[PDB]
Amino acid sequence: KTQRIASHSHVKGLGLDESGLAKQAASGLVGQENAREACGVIVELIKSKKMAGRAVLLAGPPGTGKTALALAIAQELGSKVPFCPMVGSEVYSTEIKKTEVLMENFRRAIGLRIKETKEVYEGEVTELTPCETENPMGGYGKTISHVIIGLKTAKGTKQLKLDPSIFESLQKERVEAGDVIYIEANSGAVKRQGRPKGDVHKKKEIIQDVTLHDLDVANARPQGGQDILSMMGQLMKPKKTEITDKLRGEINKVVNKYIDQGIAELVPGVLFVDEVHMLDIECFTYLHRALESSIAPIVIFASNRGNCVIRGTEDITSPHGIPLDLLDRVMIIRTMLYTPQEMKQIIKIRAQTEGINISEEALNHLGEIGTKTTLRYSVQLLTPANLLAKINGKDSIEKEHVEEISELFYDAKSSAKILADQQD
Amino acid sequence: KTQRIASHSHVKGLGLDESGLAKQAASGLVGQENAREACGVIVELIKSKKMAGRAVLLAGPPGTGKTALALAIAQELGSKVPFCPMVGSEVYSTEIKKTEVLMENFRRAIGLRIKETKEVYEGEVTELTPCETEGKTISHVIIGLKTAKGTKQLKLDPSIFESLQKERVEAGDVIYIEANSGAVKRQGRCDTYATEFDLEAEEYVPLPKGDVHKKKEIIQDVTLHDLDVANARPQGGQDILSMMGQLMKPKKTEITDKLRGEINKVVNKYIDQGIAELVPGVLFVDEVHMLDIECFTYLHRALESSIAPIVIFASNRGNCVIRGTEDITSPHGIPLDLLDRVMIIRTMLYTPQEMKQIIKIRAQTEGINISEEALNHLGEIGTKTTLRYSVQLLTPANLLAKINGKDSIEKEHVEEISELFYDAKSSAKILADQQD
Amino acid sequence: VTRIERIGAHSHIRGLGLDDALEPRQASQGMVGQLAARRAAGVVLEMIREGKIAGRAVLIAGQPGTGKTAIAMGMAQALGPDTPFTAIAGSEIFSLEMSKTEALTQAFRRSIGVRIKEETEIIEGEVVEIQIDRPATGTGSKVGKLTLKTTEMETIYDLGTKMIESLTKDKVQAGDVITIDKATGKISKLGRSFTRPDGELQKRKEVVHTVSLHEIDVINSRTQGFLALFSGDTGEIKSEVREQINAKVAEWREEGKAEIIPGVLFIDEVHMLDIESFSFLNRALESDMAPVLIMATNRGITRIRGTSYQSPHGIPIDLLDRLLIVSTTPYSEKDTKQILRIRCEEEDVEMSEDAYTVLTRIGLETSLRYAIQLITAASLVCRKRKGTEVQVDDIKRVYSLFLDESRSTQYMKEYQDA
Amino acid sequence: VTRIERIGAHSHIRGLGLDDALEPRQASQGMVGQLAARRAAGVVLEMIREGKIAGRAVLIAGQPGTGKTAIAMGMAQALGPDTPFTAIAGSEIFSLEMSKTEALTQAFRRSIGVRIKEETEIIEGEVVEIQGKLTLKTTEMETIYDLGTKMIESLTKDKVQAGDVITIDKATGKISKLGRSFTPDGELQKRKEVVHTVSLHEIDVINSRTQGFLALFSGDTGEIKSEVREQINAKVAEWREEGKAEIIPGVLFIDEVHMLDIESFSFLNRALESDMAPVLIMATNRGITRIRGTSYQSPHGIPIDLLDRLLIVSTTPYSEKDTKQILRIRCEEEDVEMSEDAYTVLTRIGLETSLRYAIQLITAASLVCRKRKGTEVQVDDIKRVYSLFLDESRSTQYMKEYQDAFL
């Protein structure tokens, strides 16, 4: 019903022309012609899939719309290409080492599409006896490792054989005569307590989109068909670091075994690292070889400051919080500053998605107060003015409403002027 | 199959004369006569076993080769005295605290010597029906063993019989048995069919050769650390499906009150009965100056103990800031507290006349002979920068000499390869220009 | 259809070109220029492939953009199959779970390897089986018979009583490929695709399996799979590896039953590291069993982490004296255009010679890596133009949109933040 | 035959010689000098033997080489066997998996002992199967024991054979042991009155589910604070009211306290103000040192708040005359005789160099004496060892080169 209005929710595409030209106003995105024309080659780089391991850094003043532009890239590539946002502060973890998070980000970024053909056997369950215990050696009495279970379906009844481990796993769960129980080749237990159309034997092709990292965690810890592995399923390991040969060599080898068959198809991902100037220098050290990797997906970075001291060095300062060796690898992108005209236009464009009718005079005043301090302030003054208009009974926002709302809340720069009075 | 000249194999130990004097060049070791006698006293201190907790120190510039001298100390005492190195970077551990690590090392040095006669009973197992029986159980076991050298009969206890029945055992199978009661069992080890098919799988091996009863004398030395860690933990395995996957082996810190007292008492009883003989260990610490001050203040109090063995230290650098203090500096990177009570051994750089001699010893140790000209020029390159540069340059000179087809090394090969591999001094000269 | 394998930065080169006289070619196996570092890489490569010595360290030094890592990549690809090669990063050894020393010596453990020569009996061929063993009045052996056919000849012999359980668990049909092993394992193939016949009637398969040093893990741990797939707990207990592992490997060596194969360790960005690891590298190399390692340092003189003193080449003198440094020179202007051409051939890009001249001037004014990033974005613009060859105007517009660090340095005059 | 206990620095002295008048002897148990330190150590040691008060702290001050640790080890042996004693270094309390308060708290608890008197009878001996009546045999005598139907079902599952030594306790304990005869003692019927001295680990057995694991290693992290006071102090308090058990005080020694965290100093306030707590013997080897973690200058590297809770006993450096006497005492350690002229050179070196160096000169010279095939050391021997091994003050002069300073 309600989209919560994240303010980033309204987008379609970059609005670029079929010939590559950037339209002035398209898809609610106005301005940053060099940025959109610069990303038009990036979306073709990700769509081409031929090249990998190339990073693109976005630079500019705060509030230039680089995050919304990256979201426009993720929405332009479609829902099939995974997009995983991250910040420089997210890599810090007590359980995980600092390098392993950045190491697995490339795994969660890259998408995978697997077609799994499964056979399902459903119906009314009719059992005869269980599997009897056996003495050591001696040949015992045979009658072991064969489970006779009949299934009654509307199409007919068919008797089926099952392994002793399957019935041993179903013995823990409640089993009664006349209940619908789903049986699959995956040794999964699906039952219904208290209670089947189609043939007894079933086959279906289930197309699933799974990231590589999900296969890494699911591969490290099995689903727990065994007793002890099911106890490990009940008690969750907080985190564990995967070895390089398992994370890369083995899983990449079996994935290559699924590629030559043609059933599974691999798709490249997009790794978005925001506020990279706060990232530690160690993640840059590993990020060198991470960017030199052949299977590493394209990475996007964002720099909110011109120059900063490198984390952990405490002495050497570098532009954009990135070392020169790493800054040479990334492709710098410069974003233009917004003009007051495109600010006055983007305020009205924002008012369209918000669903609030604003008069042109109030748009001009919001453009003035937005040019005086910041655009984001005028963005935050939209809702209180309309709410005050609903309280006073007005149908639309007026200059007096935004005057009162702007009078109540103090500006950040004005508060900075009031600050540092050396009192209390 | 091949030793592959691992590290430096030219050190056979001190090999000093019985008169006590040290030769100029003996057993591949050239020079360091004062260090030769200084390390010749401590080996007699360890062989005497009169003192416990002594401290040794090696003071010398980097490149003097005092670590190889410590290897000569280890080779002179022999394989009887336990010797293990401890680097200064291994003290820091996430699961085990540094104090427990150093304590575990002090327990690693000292060891026990147990002389045991190994009685091996192995061969085809033919199980006769037990005679004793009656409130029934087993209580008696009769197992025959047949080999090409003869046949014997051995009686076993019901507990060992259950240890055999734990695995799969059938009639006419070869089994190994030790006096430790451990028995390696293999189902169907003998070569037979009798079933008309070869698909029985298992292991098809012909009847072994040799006598059934094997009497040997084996002297096993076990460090006290493995005894404390082995006895502190239940040390069980493969008897439970859940516990083997449940135990993560956190290696938590042991308690000194119960464990050290218990192990000390039981070892005292074992050595009082004459079964075991306690032998001291040797601890050789590297980069002692890089430890934290807490490891120092725990280190001196730890070595002041009567149960602490002799420890050897080495100082690879001069006066430096103490780790963790960030302010107070002390000579040799060690505080004045621990620098006292530790013996000091002088190690001085070699004169340039021994460069060609050491290079010659490494050359004849590698197995390749070099010409006098290549030894003079290579020696000049060695004394011009450092000995390690020439010693490490000895191998590629023989490599290029073998590629070109020459049986020996020539001055053109060593002087030609010297320009390809830059020494650290020249590499430091090309740098510092603040370029690129 | 496609292998879905994306080409990286160092994936353009395959192998390392060398000659018997140690004369580097102008362009060999993708490597262009750096004749000194090529010959040095051939010397250390021949020395590594010799396997006669172990424990030697070789360091390579070069400025950023000189292609120092690609040489080690060519050494890794040209090292040959079945040769253990360990590649780690300077920051990868830092972990909260395990200590940096245990992780470093764990890499040294993964570098070395052991080759064991064993021989087993493996049956290969189809399976023709008629099972009468299912029905029985009483308890019996229910042996039955078995008929197998192979292109060489056919064999007919009875089924096993111990393996009939594995035969009932696994899928066994007419014309299905199933291989029975002496280890009593389950290994089978697809018989429906081949039959819509291979092997011998009786044949033994002797395979030499290279055993990594990870055997220490399965020896110490209760289960081999858990700690092999993920890190799990920390390393093995002290004094256990030397006693049990050195004793066992001492029983394997010199007896002719197994041999020791040293590996290659590769550390990246060693300029920034703690002094504890630098101190552990020396004694780790002085150990009896140590791999031959190569480390790459791009930066110049830099302060080492953990201390306030600035060591030359970002490494203390103790470790610098322990290894030999091989310095690499930057690429010449004549070799730059050759690198651009071989990258055009590797990436299937067609560019005009004028674009190689202007882009070569860009390689003279700015680092070559930035040009390698310009051609990739320029090829897509050439795809937008629909032409089959890149033009100077397209790559010029790409140079206009994407600005280099040296070009974007003059745009910091805005003073957005400080 | 080499016992674990060996000769060492502090291992040559056994017990602390005292008198009824508390006058330290000239040479007592291998201790010469420090009459004030030995007398005050005897006063505080008598305070430990009385046990009339708890939560006391004694700090000894002096120059390095005055035998601070030797006095503590001397008082440790004079405390008597079968008494809890805990001496831990300042760095032992640091743990990554454990809090800094847990290690110090357990250091205060483990030193306090508890004496419990329990009377239990133990019947142990061999086993003879007779068909259910088992005949128990011993070397001294042999008796017949009749068994009902209760223990038969228990012995059918357990492994019991004729000749095995079995120990059954009227506590209803059952212990099976090896025969230890072909590979016991006393009597079969005996009433044993045993006084079991128990440490404060009762907190650990009550907190933990099983004491077997945590008895062999430090194990679990910090226990709940309420259990150590309410439950433990409640049970022990009721045991004091009933009179079953009697708590015995103990000594807690900490060395090199100059370097410690301020959190430990702030915890020692309540540790000393706690109801039950052992006496504290502290040894500080540095007069003024900055406390780690903060920038401050205070005597003995301790805060001024805790400075008034310690009783400081000053020490004096040993005279040149007493050095020859204590060295003569150290000559009896290795059973090596020295010439009369050797004590002049050894003491002369001990005047300008640390005493421990002179302690190592005799032991290091005795080996060269063995290489000389002589029965007594010579002046040339120690003069040669002085050239082989030099003191720090001598090695500092040769460090003036500073070829590689690593700076």
Ligand SMILES: Nc1ncnc2c1ncn2[C@@H]1O[C@H](COP(=O)(O)OP(=O)(O)O)[C@@H](O)[C@H]1O
């Ligand atoms: N060109 C644009 N078109 C539409 N909306 C924009 C544009 N630039 C910025 N915005 C809006 O401004 C808001 C804040 O942008 P912000 O994320 O602060 O930019 P940056 O990431 O560059 O700091 C976003 O919610 C976005 O909707």
Ligand SMILES: Nc1ncnc2c1ncn2[C@@H]1O[C@H](COP(=O)(O)OP(=O)(O)O)[C@@H](O)[C@H]1O
């Ligand atoms: N007395 C000696 N004669 C000849 N070579 C020696 C001698 N002592 C040491 N070496 C050489 O020094 C090398 C070991 O040096 P090392 O102890 O590692 O130096 P550092 O102590 O500076 O690290 C060995 O390879 C050995 O060949």
Ligand SMILES: Nc1ncnc2c1ncn2[C@@H]1O[C@H](COP(=O)(O)OP(=O)(O)O)[C@@H](O)[C@H]1O
């Ligand atoms: N011999 C070569 N031929 C072609 N390209 C090379 C060669 N050597 C290096 N490169 C290029 O250099 C890039 C990697 O440079 P790198 O080794 O990181 O430089 P540096 O070691 O100075 O940081 C690769 O993308 C590769 O295309």
Ligand SMILES: Nc1ncnc2c1ncn2[C@@H]1O[C@H](COP(=O)(O)OP(=O)(O)O)[C@@H](O)[C@H]1O
């Ligand atoms: N009064 C004494 N009598 C006998 N031996 C002593 C005496 N004082 C000190 N020592 C010996 O001196 C050695 C070094 O003492 P040390 O621990 O350095 O004292 P401190 O801790 O006060 O510096 C000890 O092993 C001890 O045996």
